[PDB]
Swiss-Prot record, chain A:
Residues with PTM Phosphoserine: S68
Organism: Saccharomyces cerevisiae (strain ATCC 204508 / S288c)
Species lineage: Eukaryota, Fungi, Dikarya, Ascomycota, Saccharomycotina
A single GO BP: cytoplasmic translation
Region annotation (Interaction with P1A-P2B) ranges: 199-230
Keywords: Cytoplasm, Isopeptide bond, Phosphoprotein, Ribonucleoprotein, Ribosomal protein, Ubl conjugation
Name of the molecule in the record: Large ribosomal subunit protein uL10
Localization per Swiss-Prot or TrEMBL: Cytoplasm
Swiss-Prot record, chain B:
GO molecular function terms listed in the Swiss-Prot or TrEMBL record: protein kinase activator activity; ribonucleoprotein complex binding; structural constituent of ribosome
Quaternary state and interactors: Component of the large ribosomal subunit (LSU). Mature yeast ribosomes consist of a small (40S) and a large (60S) subunit. The 40S small subunit contains 1 molecule of ribosomal RNA (18S rRNA) and 33 different proteins (encoded by 57 genes). The large 60S subunit contains 3 rRNA molecules (25S, 5.8S and 5S rRNA) and 46 different proteins (encoded by 81 genes). The 5 acidic ribosomal P-proteins form the stalk structure of the 60S subunit. They are organized as a pentameric complex in which uL10/P0 interacts with 2 heterodimers, P1A-P2B and P1B-P2A.
Post-translational modification: N-terminally acetylated by acetyltransferase NatA.
Family: Belongs to the eukaryotic ribosomal protein P1/P2 family.
Extra remark: The 4 small acidic ribosomal P-proteins from yeast can be classified into two couples of similar but not identical sequences. Each couple (P1A/P1B and P2A/P2B) is distinctly related to one of the two acidic ribosomal P-proteins P1/P2 present in multicellular organisms.
Native organism: Saccharomyces cerevisiae (strain ATCC 204508 / S288c)
Cellular compartment(s): Cytoplasm
GO cellular component labels: cytosolic large ribosomal subunit
Protein name, per record: Large ribosomal subunit protein P1A
Listed GO biological process terms: cytoplasmic translation; translational elongation
Presence of keyword Ribonucleoprotein: yes
Source superkingdom: Eukaryota
Record has Ribosomal protein as a keyword: yes
Curated annotation (Swiss-Prot), chain C:
Protein name, as recorded: Large ribosomal subunit protein P2A
Organism: Saccharomyces cerevisiae (strain ATCC 204508 / S288c)
Positions carrying Phosphoserine: S40, S43, S49
Further comment found in the protein's record: The 4 small acidic ribosomal P-proteins from yeast can be classified into two couples of similar but not identical sequences. Each couple (P1A/P1B and P2A/P2B) is distinctly related to one of the two acidic ribosomal P-proteins P1/P2 present in multicellular organisms.
Modified residues (Phosphothreonine): T16
UniProtKB/Swiss-Prot annotation, chain D:
Protein name (database record): Large ribosomal subunit protein uL11A
Additional remarks: Present with 68500 molecules/cell in log phase SD medium.
Taxonomic lineage: Eukaryota, Fungi, Dikarya, Ascomycota, Saccharomycotina
GO MF annotations in UniProt: large ribosomal subunit rRNA binding; structural constituent of ribosome
Principal place of residence: cytoplasm
Chain positions with Phosphoserine modification: S14, S27
Function statement: Component of the ribosome, a large ribonucleoprotein complex responsible for the synthesis of proteins in the cell. The small ribosomal subunit (SSU) binds messenger RNAs (mRNAs) and translates the encoded message by selecting cognate aminoacyl-transfer RNA (tRNA) molecules. The large subunit (LSU) contains the ribosomal catalytic site termed the peptidyl transferase center (PTC), which catalyzes the formation of peptide bonds, thereby polymerizing the amino acids delivered by tRNAs into a polypeptide chain.
Ranges in coiled-coil conformation: none
Placement of covalent cross-link Glycyl lysine isopeptide (Lys-Gly) (interchain with G-Cter in ubiquitin): K119
Record key words, sorted: Cytoplasm, Isopeptide bond, Methylation, Phosphoprotein, Ribonucleoprotein, Ribosomal protein, RNA-binding, Ubl conjugation
Subcellular localization, as worded in the UniProt entry: Cytoplasm
GO biological process, one term: ribosomal large subunit assembly
RNA sequence: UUCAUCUAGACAGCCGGACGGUGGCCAUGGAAGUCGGAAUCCGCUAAGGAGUGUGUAACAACUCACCGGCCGAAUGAACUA
């Protein structure tokens, strides 16, 4: 607790060797996620390969870079945001995102935070006795007293995605027991092998590629059927085209055989 | 087929489907060149709309 | 597309990865590969049975 | 949670159970039985027991615990009579004993590694 | 003037985060972070002190430590005339 380091250049020095030891380096966001949730998330990572420290002591990827030949300076705009960590890993890029991003733990929203997604409150009895119903009304949640209990009149959106949640708004929602978001280490960024990946990449489609694969597979298949080029898959169809076309000439015409 | 897949990639890349161009992709794959099969393939593909064939098919 | 055909063509020969083959085929096409597109296709490919996806055709 | 204090073997004290309210959410001596059964050996120093209440059930969070685990293994009931230097009783745990206390703790504890877990218990043991 | 903190980013303000060994021995009606009185290791590790103040008979939260950002260049404490 006392004045003694609280190190400077020493913890940087441990950190120096840590980007260099591991191939894959992640820039990640704790801010939202509780620490039973973070600490559990980190338990997963830790078996595989581990996370270490900084401020601006983090931004010093430059010294690490300077030791090797890899980036500077050169990077697009140093992506770091409030509340950032570095994850040093063996684990390839694509898999790291699926562990972290898919498996998030739940928790409540916060006052003065920008809502990540649309917020709704449901209609039904709150179960609470008469009191300051007014507080609910202030937010733009309609309520009225039915059967001597406070009830919310209708489902409505209290706050949208990309708008901030007001201090009153948050508190009242917590009393309702309404939470809902997914928390865990938001991925800002990846370095691997001289290459910079931003977060759009990092949510990694995949269903779209199945559709594209199957469509590519059909292009090949099509080409095969029509073209007549008989390795294993195409063959029985290619023979059929030469009929499809004969059987066919009969249907329009008006010679009967 | 490696030869059919080679043709569709060559058209997607924007390069003509000929014996040299199929041979370079085929060699990069590591599959041995066979003169008869790429020659039939270029010949079958001659006079074709690759685009029009690609889309219908049962 | 370039990427799709390239891994498909290799799959017919029976083998594939980032530098060794994907990069090799597209480079044999004469085209410069975007790393992000290769990485995305590979990451998607992991733990998938390509043969099973083909068996439904879409 | 709303927390509570306990002594080994105690039940039904007026000051401790009645104003703090009887868990089970009514009817003390439900919990009064439940805590008491569990409590073990002689009273010694007070432990926390911590109250959690559910519909018509009580549950307590009780750790005397990893150190009470040490007591069982050593066969020594006290704690370090003359702190950090050398104990008055001669309770030297073995290396084999401490990794087995660590094995069992490893669910309760976060710890990454078993070797990490051995430090955490050992640090508790010395002081 | 003298001692400390600053481009490794101080400072004013505003913004923001906290899992686990484990509610720690003595004594007493009673201390359990915070009436009195011990040692002080460690996980993992951006980070997460056996704790800074606000509590109740005692227990019972919330903040702070420690840590991160928005800004950018000096800074505050002691004496002296």
């Amino acid at each position: 607790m006392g004045g003694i380091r609280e190190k400077k250049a020493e913890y940087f020095a441990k950190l120096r060797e840590y980007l260099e030891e591991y191939k894959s380096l992640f820039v990640v966001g704790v801010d939202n996620v509780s620490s039973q949730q973070m600490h559990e998330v980190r338990k997963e990572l830790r078996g595989r390969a581990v996370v270490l420290m900084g401020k601006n002591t983090m931004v010093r990827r430059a010294i690490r870079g300077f030791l090797s030949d890899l980036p500077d300076f050169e990077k697009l705009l140093p992506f770091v945001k409030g509340n950032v960590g570095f994850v040093f890993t063996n684990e390839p890029l694509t898999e790291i995102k699926n562990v972290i991003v898919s498996n998030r733990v739940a928790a409540p929203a916060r006052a003065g935070a920008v809502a990540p997604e649309d917020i709704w409150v449901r209609a039904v009895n709150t179960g609470m006795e008469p009191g300051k119903t007014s507080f609910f009304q202030a937010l733009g949640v309609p309520t009225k007293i039915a059967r001597g209990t406070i009830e919310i009149v209708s489902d409505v959106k209290v706050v949208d995605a990309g708008n901030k949640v007001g201090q009153s708004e948050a508190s009242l929602l917590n009393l309702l027991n309404i939470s809902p978001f997914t928390f865990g280490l938001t991925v800002v960024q990846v370095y691997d092998n001289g290459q910079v990946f931003p977060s759009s990449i990092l949510d990694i489609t995949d269903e779209e590629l199945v559709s594209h694969f199957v469509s590519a597979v059909s292009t090949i298949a099509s080409i095969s059927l029509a073209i007549g080029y008989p390795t294993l898959p195409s063959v029985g169809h290619t023979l059929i085209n030469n009929y499809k076309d004969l059987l066919a000439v009969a249907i329009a015409a008006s010679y009967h055989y | 087929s490696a030869l059919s897949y080679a043709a569709l990639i060559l058209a997607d890349s924007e390069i003509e489907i000929s014996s040299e161009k199929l041979l370079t992709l085929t060699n990069a794959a590591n599959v041995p060149d066979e003169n008869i099969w790429a020659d039939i393939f270029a010949k079958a593909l001659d006079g074709q709309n690759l685009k029009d064939l690609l889309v219908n098919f049962s | 597309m370039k990427y799709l055909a390239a891994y498909l063509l290799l799959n017919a020969a029976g083998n594939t990865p980032d530098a060794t083959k994907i990069k090799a085929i597209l480079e044999s096409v004469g085209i410069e590969i975007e790393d992000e597109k290769v990485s995305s296709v590979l990451s998607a490919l992991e733990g998938k049975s390509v043969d099973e996806l083909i068996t439904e055709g879409n | 949670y709303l927390y509570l204090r306990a002594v080994g073997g105690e039940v039904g004290a007026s000051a401790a159970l009645a104003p703090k309210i009887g868990p089970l959410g009514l009817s003390p001596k439900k919990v009064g039985e439940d805590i008491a059964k569990a409590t073990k050996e002689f009273k010694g120093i007070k432990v926390t027991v911590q109250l959690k209440i559910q519909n018509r059930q009580a549950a307590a969070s009780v750790v005397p615990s990893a150190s009470s685990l040490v007591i069982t293994a050593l066969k020594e009931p006290p704690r370090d009579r003359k702190k950090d230097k050398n104990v008055k009783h001669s309770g030297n745990i073995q290396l084999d004993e401490i990794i087995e206390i660590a094995r069992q703790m490893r669910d309760k504890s976060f710890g990454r590694t078993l070797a990490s877990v051995t430090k955490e218990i050992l640090g508790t043991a010395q002081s």
